[PDB]
Design a protein around this ligand. Sequence first.
Ligand SMILES: Nc1ncnc2c1ncn2[C@@H]1O[C@H](COP(=O)(O)OP(=O)(O)O)[C@@H](O)[C@H]1O
Ligand SMILES: Nc1ncnc2c1ncn2[C@@H]1O[C@H](COP(=O)(O)OP(=O)(O)O)[C@@H](O)[C@H]1O
Ligand SMILES: Nc1ncnc2c1ncn2[C@@H]1O[C@H](COP(=O)(O)OP(=O)(O)O)[C@@H](O)[C@H]1O
Ligand SMILES: Nc1ncnc2c1ncn2[C@@H]1O[C@H](COP(=O)(O)OP(=O)(O)O)[C@@H](O)[C@H]1O
Ligand SMILES: [Mg+2]
Ligand SMILES: [Mg+2]
Ligand SMILES: [Mg+2]
Lengths: 433, 447, 49, 442, 443
Amino acid sequence: LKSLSLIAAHSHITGLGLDENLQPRPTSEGMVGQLQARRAAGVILKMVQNGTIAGRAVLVAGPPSTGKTALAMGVSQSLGKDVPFTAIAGSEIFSLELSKTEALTQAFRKSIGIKIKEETELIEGEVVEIQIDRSITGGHKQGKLTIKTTDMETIYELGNKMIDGLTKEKVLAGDVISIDKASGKITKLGRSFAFVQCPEGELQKRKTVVHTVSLHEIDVINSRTQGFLALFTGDTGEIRSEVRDQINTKVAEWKEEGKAEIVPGVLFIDEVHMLDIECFSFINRALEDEFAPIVMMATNRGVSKTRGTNYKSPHGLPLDLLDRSIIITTKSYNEQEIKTILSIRAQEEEVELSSDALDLLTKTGVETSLRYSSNLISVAQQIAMKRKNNTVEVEDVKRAYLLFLDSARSVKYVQENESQYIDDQGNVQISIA
Amino acid sequence: LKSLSLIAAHSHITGLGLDENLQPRPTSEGMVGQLQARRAAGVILKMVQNGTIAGRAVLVAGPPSTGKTALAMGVSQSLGKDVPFTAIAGSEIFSLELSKTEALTQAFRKSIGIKIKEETELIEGEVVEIQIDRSITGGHKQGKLTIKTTDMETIYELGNKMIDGLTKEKVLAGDVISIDKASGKITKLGRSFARSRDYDAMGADTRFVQCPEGELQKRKTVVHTVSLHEIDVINSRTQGFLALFTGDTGEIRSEVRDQINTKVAEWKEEGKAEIVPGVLFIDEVHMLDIECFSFINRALEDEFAPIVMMATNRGVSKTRGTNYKSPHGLPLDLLDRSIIITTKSYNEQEIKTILSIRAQEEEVELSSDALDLLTKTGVETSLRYSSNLISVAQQIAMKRKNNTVEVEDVKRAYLLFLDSARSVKYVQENESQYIDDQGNVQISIAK
Amino acid sequence: VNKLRCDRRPIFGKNLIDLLTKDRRVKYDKSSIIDNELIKPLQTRVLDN
Amino acid sequence: TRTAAHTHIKGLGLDESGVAKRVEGGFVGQIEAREACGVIVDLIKAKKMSGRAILLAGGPSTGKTALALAISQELGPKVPFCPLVGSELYSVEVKKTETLMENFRRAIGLRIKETKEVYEGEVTELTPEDAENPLGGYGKTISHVIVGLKSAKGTKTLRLDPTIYESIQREKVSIGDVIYIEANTGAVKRVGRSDAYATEFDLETEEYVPLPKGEVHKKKEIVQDVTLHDLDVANARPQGGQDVISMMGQLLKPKKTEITEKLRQEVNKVVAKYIDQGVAELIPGVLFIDEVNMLDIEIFTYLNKALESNIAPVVVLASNRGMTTVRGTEDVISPHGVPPDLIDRLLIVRTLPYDKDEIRTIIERRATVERLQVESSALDLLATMGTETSLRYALQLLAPCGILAQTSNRKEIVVNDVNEAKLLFLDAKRSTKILETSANYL
Amino acid sequence: VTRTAAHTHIKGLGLDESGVAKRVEGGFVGQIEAREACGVIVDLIKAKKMSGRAILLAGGPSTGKTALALAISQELGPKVPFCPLVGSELYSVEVKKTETLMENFRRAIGLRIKETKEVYEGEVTELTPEDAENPLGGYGKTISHVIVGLKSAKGTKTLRLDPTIYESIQREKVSIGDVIYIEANTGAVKRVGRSDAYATEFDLETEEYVPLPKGEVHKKKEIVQDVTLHDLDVANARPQGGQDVISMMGQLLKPKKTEITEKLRQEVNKVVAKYIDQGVAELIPGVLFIDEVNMLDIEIFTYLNKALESNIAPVVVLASNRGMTTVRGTEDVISPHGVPPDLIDRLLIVRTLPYDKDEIRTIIERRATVERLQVESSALDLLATMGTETSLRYALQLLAPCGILAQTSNRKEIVVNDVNEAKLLFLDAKRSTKILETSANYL
Ligand SMILES: Nc1ncnc2c1ncn2[C@@H]1O[C@H](COP(=O)(O)OP(=O)(O)O)[C@@H](O)[C@H]1O
Ligand SMILES: Nc1ncnc2c1ncn2[C@@H]1O[C@H](COP(=O)(O)OP(=O)(O)O)[C@@H](O)[C@H]1O
Ligand SMILES: Nc1ncnc2c1ncn2[C@@H]1O[C@H](COP(=O)(O)OP(=O)(O)O)[C@@H](O)[C@H]1O
Ligand SMILES: Nc1ncnc2c1ncn2[C@@H]1O[C@H](COP(=O)(O)OP(=O)(O)O)[C@@H](O)[C@H]1O
Ligand SMILES: [Mg+2]
Ligand SMILES: [Mg+2]
Ligand SMILES: [Mg+2]
């Protein structure tokens, strides 16, 4: 129910928080401001929830300290369970054991999943007693027991393999167990009278079981007999393309038969400004396949040089990828919006702030970067904890301000002391006299 | 003497020429001159023999052929056996199998040693008769075996589990075996001498040893010297001892190293194992990657850091991996934590002693006038040069069959083999004949 | 046979078998723990899947 | 007693809820720096925030690393602290990204505590108890098994369910042998024979342990801590002696493999399951990267997305350099070598050079740990030399002056000894000045 | 019949006992200085006292450097190990170049091993087990000894064996009438095959047949085989022993080079250092030869400095052509011959002179005599002028095709018209560049 969780930057935001009309609310579901951005992201949200379209790319641009990464986080949160969501960094695709193109395809394979359902019978009931028949050095053994439930009291003989299972996990008359016929697995809900009541209903019931497996897993399983170990060990390379071409046909047949349904996922890539050109040239073609997960990116870089080429392309990506991709920009934050973000960060971290400390923190947060002002709010509580009261006061924020330096403040301090710091040329003065 | 007897660059240097007052002798212990540098090395020598300090670096500086390599080599000889020493090169730590960081970590690990002592209680003696009853009554009837030693003989009762253990590694008696006291392990040393005449051709397992002398069971302690690196390689693999000889380490994870450090800490607390501080010497460090420099800067501050000494003859020059030129060829951070020892070029008076002391090593008798020409050519050339001419002139004089090397043979030896300065001139005049950087060469002599 | 025995016998272990088991065996006890349920080795996952 | 450039640092040296003392824990000066780090110690002890990084910048020999060792001391031995260098990220086995992600998960530890009741002692005797079976039968029926236990200072008799006969048969214990019995889990364990039985046989291969001390019934608790990475390695690595996959483990070589995200999340699931029941306790640790200037821009990029992770711990950075070109990009210029986007996510802690009066106290405090004592006259030279040449030079000259003092048999350093040590060992500036006057290529 | 590639006409240096070089000897013409210079090298190699000494011979292209480097190897003899090496071969994908350099360094030196073995061989007449009626308490069932008779042409003998070496025979599935090989030292039994006289027993047979071994029964022999130290290291790294299923797959896997630790090398030097003290073994030095040393990286050049200072370092000879050029792996460094000056300081420099035209005319003559062909003198002069106008190695290449045109013209001797015809079909580099400069697409 709860994965290991600590206070994080993207913690507070849950869901995209859009109206049924798709218009954004001023403050909803942890997100504040950025109207056109959240709406344009919601169009993509209902676009994925439709699932009738494939092979589309979209880009989220902007300067630093935007929330485009937060926006995509809100799209992944509003996406909900049962929809696979894969987020990889741009520098992750580079690998020594695997090719960059092969790993790039491996990223496309993980995003789209497949659901398969099946029905398995189940017997759940209390035990009256157990009777086993064995012989010392005599081989064959014979078990018998008696299962009891409110409306049904019956007696079942024990098979050869049922004996080993009942001996593996201790079964008693007091203990209530539930066993599947086909699986043969023994499941103990707990202990009855020496705290669960006898199960209601019939002794034998049939319930459906659903299994969900990503395309990448099916791809790795069929490569080698030990290829199943490559799932957990993560060691696999140069998967045969013929295996993928066969898997696509088998999955298509599974869709036509109605046996297995596919769930389209979302692929998210962070820091796409640095990527090799072979990766882009492979993406251009790879987005046109029948199963292509919806791709959303993030680029905070302006006009710069693409890695692998000497020339400088606009936005940091070649124009071939900019063509088929859609560009969703972002804008800076108002002075009041920063105050709202800092306030909801205080609510997420559960830290009470004074009004004057909120105004001062908003001013020094507008002058400097926003993420820095969000960084001080966590230390303010620790500094105020020594004062033995729980509050954030302007004095404590000033002390935290002189203790921790802003980047722009450190730029000057480096520039005056440059003789003390190590120059790019290598010269440094370590002596005061 | 245990090492191979083939002569090396410097075979004459043994130990250092410092007294108990550390004042160097002008010619002693195989070396010559370099008084201040030798004393500065002896301070490091007592610094290692003390063992109370750790994590320090020292540098040896000088031009080529100044004695920097014969200096650190003299330190390893005076240091003696049982004190672990590691001499590598900066270019050797570049490997495709290991990363430079881990390859340098192993270079720091091999230098520091560990001495482990262990005591054993064993019962060793020759067997006379072994009786085991089976069908008389049954069920481990308590057979008895008689063990014989030269000065003592006793009879031992055998338990049921010992009855089962004696069946494996079957013993007919007439044999010398040893049984561990703690674990009851049975070990077969080999047959006695009376069994040698039974067969004309015998297997490869058989052998003959004398009957053990003295008491039947004894208490003996054994001492072992194992470096931390060997411990880490052994603990890293199921079988790591084969990985030692095959040379494939596998880039041991740094997680195991902390566990090994705790193990050594507990062994030192119990007093079973004491550590010997080692020495690490890296030759020609002027070529090294910057990542290795930073990792040396950090790795020198740990609890076990072997004393590091290095020699670099480069002046102010560009470091490998960066565009800028740092002085000495090393970053200023590595020079900040270090101590620099400078060596000065030899004079004429010292060179002739370095020559004759070399002829004593090559066992080549020289005339009084041969050292004059060899020294005169030794001043213009480098000291490391004429030392080869002292070797060739011995063969040229051997063709003339007469005793010591005559001066004329030295002149012929100098005439046949060109100096490094002359080849530059012969190349500069003949440039059209030799290949050029641009690739242009004139093969044909006809114009 | 004298030279045969003079050759065969001096076989010296470069380190030891007792040094291999001396630097391996752990002083710490077994300490039976629930960590056995926190491991689930790769071989068992083939059976559970 | 080994001392390398350290060990005179004991903790941060703070006081209770106040400004740091002038001199404590071998620290002199820089009260603001170790105070600001003092707040970071509280932030780490809070065990709440995640992926929060800080960077202390300053010139060389300003005490950058000693602060990280100090906070490492302040956290305690139980809190995991991983020393790491930026040069270690490059490995031939796996990509740098996987090594960085692995070191990121090496920081957080997990503690497990377990209380189990035990029954240990010798065996006085074993007798069955016959009772009537529920359904009539001719053969024997045993209701319970009686087991006596003898230990030092006490004795006890127990009654067990008849199902214990299978475990006792498995352990093959009969009489006069010390056993191991766990209360609720049950069965048995045979540690070894009792000590008084060694005399009955002159030669035996079974060891005899003494009777257990104290009561026969005991309750003890054992706490075991394991990091999440060490937990993941055991999950990914196969374990068996004779297994065919394990058979391929031998004769081949193990190499570090990139661990999938699915496995990490799967371990997080069971760790969360045990932390919900109260049996597990998750303590975040601290990662420390020295010389961050040596990191490529590809790692700096992965730190941006990595620090925003939920389980990401607190990582402290140190960069001595000033404005430099980031590795991997020739045109880009950023302070300290850290890209501005990454600088935006952290807090900078400045460091200042030490005063002359602080330097003299540094050397005089180093003398105590060095165990060497110096006069007042020779110390004043070490101060001026330390300020002119460099700080680490006067600290490096301490041992040679003591060895020369032992050659002169004097127990304390003298001005003549520090001058003689000055002539033998040269600092950087003198050597660089000698290189210019020599045409020998020196 | 016989193959000749730019070589095989040099049988050695051809030096007199006084060290003076003849005008022409052993397929070598001129170059008295360089010949006398290498003879002293051969003497130093025979002296065995010096180790790690190195001598560099550098000259222009086609000056006879390499041809002389083969002549010294011919002068040393087959017993002295000689390992040819090229700088471009030191780079390997499996292991770092350094381990390959140090590896060849140990491949140069070599060691001789002598050991005596005694073997009983012959046809098995009658073999019987002998069981002891005494139980002894140690075993349930065993044998005291096994007697196996052996038949040979010179005589027959009966042997008394232990049950283990008989168990080996039972593993070999030996039956009466089959020749066996039993060695006393290792105690190994090998079945050669069934005796030849028994072949007529069956019409069709799978087993091979061999004659009965000569010799009485027992034989005493020693083996003087010489083996390099590096071969002891490789045999030390990969064990051939054991029946384990792991060892089988270990034999199946391809050999992969690995970096050998210094400890193992030190142990091998210890056991060899003991065997040379017992007199059972004798160590001999050997010569390492590297061609195109200029192709080496500055890393290998630096490691050569530490490698030459080792005691086991063999004599190595270097040969380079180019003048002062930028050393590979260095940016602004310029050094003569493409070798760093610190290494040049260690070596000894020998210079190689070019060849006069009158010497070239004799070179073509000797190459023709070894080529066995027939050349007219009038065409010999033209071939000499041709060789002097273009290159020395071009006329030696011109001797080959003319022999074919002479056969098509049926003439036994080469004629001026034949070589004049051969010049038009085959061009040298100078003409190829001239025609290369003016053309449409890259000539
Ligand atoms: N609309 C928003 N609602 C809440 N938080 C926001 C919003 N926009 C930005 N943020 C804050 O910005 C911080 C990180 O900004 P981010 O988008 O990661 O910068 P970059 O675009 O450089 O990656 C997050 O901690 C988040 O709290
Ligand atoms: N103390 C000494 N006494 C005699 N000869 C020496 C001494 N030191 C060095 N040499 C000579 O110097 C040569 C080695 O110089 P080396 O230390 O290798 O210079 P570098 O290390 O600069 O290359 C040897 O041939 C040796 O004869
Ligand atoms: N407060 C202090 N008191 C005494 N010595 C100090 C103090 N701070 C630093 N040092 C000295 O500085 C050295 C560590 O310097 P370090 O921080 O590694 O330099 P850099 O900043 O270049 O990393 C230690 O050996 C220690 O003796
Ligand atoms: N002095 C000589 N006598 C006879 N043949 C020679 C002589 N010098 C060179 N050659 C011939 O020249 C050919 C090529 O010369 P080579 O030694 O390969 O030149 P390089 O040393 O530049 O490689 C060889 O096949 C050799 O037969
Ligand atoms: Mg971002
Ligand atoms: Mg050297
Ligand atoms: Mg530091």
